[PDB]
Paper text:
Microbial epoxide hydrolases, cis-epoxysuccinate hydrolases (CESHs), have been utilized for commercial production of enantiomerically pure L(+)- and D(−)-tartaric acids for decades. All these three CESH[L]s exhibit high sequence identity (>60%) with L-2-haloacid dehalogenases, which are members of the haloacid dehalogenase (HAD)-like superfamily. Studies have shown that both [name][L] and KlCESH[L] adopt a two-step catalytic reaction mechanism by 18O-labeling studies.
However, sulfate ions, from the crystallizing solutions, were observed in the catalytic pockets of [name][L] after the co-crystallization with CES. Activity assays revealed a decrease in [name][L] activity with increasing sulfate ion concentration, indicating that sulfate ions can compete for the binding site during catalysis. However, the binding of non-catalytic ligands, including sulfate ions and products L-TA, did not cause significant structural changes.
Numbering used by the authors:
A (entry chain A), B (entry chain A): 11 to 247
Amino acid sequence: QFRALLFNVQGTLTDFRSTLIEHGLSILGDRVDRELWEELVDQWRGCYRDELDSLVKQEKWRSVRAVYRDSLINLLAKFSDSFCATSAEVELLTDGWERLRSWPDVPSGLEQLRSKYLVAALTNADFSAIVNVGRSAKLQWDAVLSAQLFGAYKPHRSTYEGAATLLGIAPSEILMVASHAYDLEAAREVGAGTAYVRRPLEYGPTGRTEDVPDGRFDFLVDSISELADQLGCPRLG
Amino acid sequence: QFRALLFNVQGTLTDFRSTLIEHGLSILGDRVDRELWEELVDQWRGCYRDELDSLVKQEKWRSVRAVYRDSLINLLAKFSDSFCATSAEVELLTDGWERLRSWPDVPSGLEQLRSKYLVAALTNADFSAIVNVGRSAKLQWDAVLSAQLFGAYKPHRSTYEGAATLLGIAPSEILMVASHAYDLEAAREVGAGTAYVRRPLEYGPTGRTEDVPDGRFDFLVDSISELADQLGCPRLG
């Protein structure tokens, strides 16, 4: 049925929240309490989503590192009574989004899939960021694709179409994998299969995750290894 | 000194001549003698180089699969008194360029390099072809880049520049690796370091390879593992 799996990376494969919480506390030290920094990180992810939503509607693209940097500067101003950061620290903090750690199932899940399928990233992050995340999150791909290559963010149909034509594969032979329904719904409109990965801690222990019923998408799993099993991939030794 | 190594793939890392000789003999069987098919393969590689040279001068890009297909059709006509192929076999034969095998040093050499450096392909082959070659040649990369992404073939400066800006790395911190001097000279003009890999069998046992003296490029090696040693990469177990 499928020749390749195409992955949403941030959140789907990476625990960005834990990464940015620990990264920020490492840089800022005793000047901020953990509970306060956690709140900023949650608003930071929200600002990122709000900006990409706005740029998608305007059919525009800009550097996602810049999106993260600009939203951090705005949030630092909002939190300025509580703590401060230097310009140098703004850059170091923004780097956290290029140091994401993976969920524990992900490296072995990707390896298991590759016995039968090509695996590729299709991320909204800049190309340089996802290459760096491959090292921090221990991701090995057949190909790395970024919104930067297409001048458009997911869910714009040109991202999925361009991924298909670059890979030389029909959309019906691509399985889109994500912990976000918006991405799967958009891939399905281009012709791709859909696999939803539940990430109940993506927004934290007291966080808010989507509710996806069985049957909405082609697969509904709790880990990448489970998806590999359901696709008939033999287990690793 | 360097953050990433950027690789010429066909020839530099892959024995395309042996691949296409055995691939063609597998498809065509007893209808062609090995010595005759070898001659076609050598002319086929030459036709590919002649066409890319022509397209570079015209500042044009087209599918490299189409370049290989069109040149094969021309050569089949030239050799038509000796043997024939069907349209279906033209496609199967053209597929050989996406099934290239690596030189024996290459998979472990790339793995050794990755302890210290990002490694990426920068190939003139289409994106889909180099993804397929990663499986046949056992190549694992941090990123895959193709002339198709830039609408221009190497040696056009926009390929090296675009690779640098996509990776987020200064050209002076990129080491270009190739068994072809034209590619290294062009990368050097953009600011990259240069590593020449001798491949004395690239054009066959009685084949013609360049003569490169010590000092022309930053490194001059006989294998990727040797390059890794010279870059201070610890050996594999």
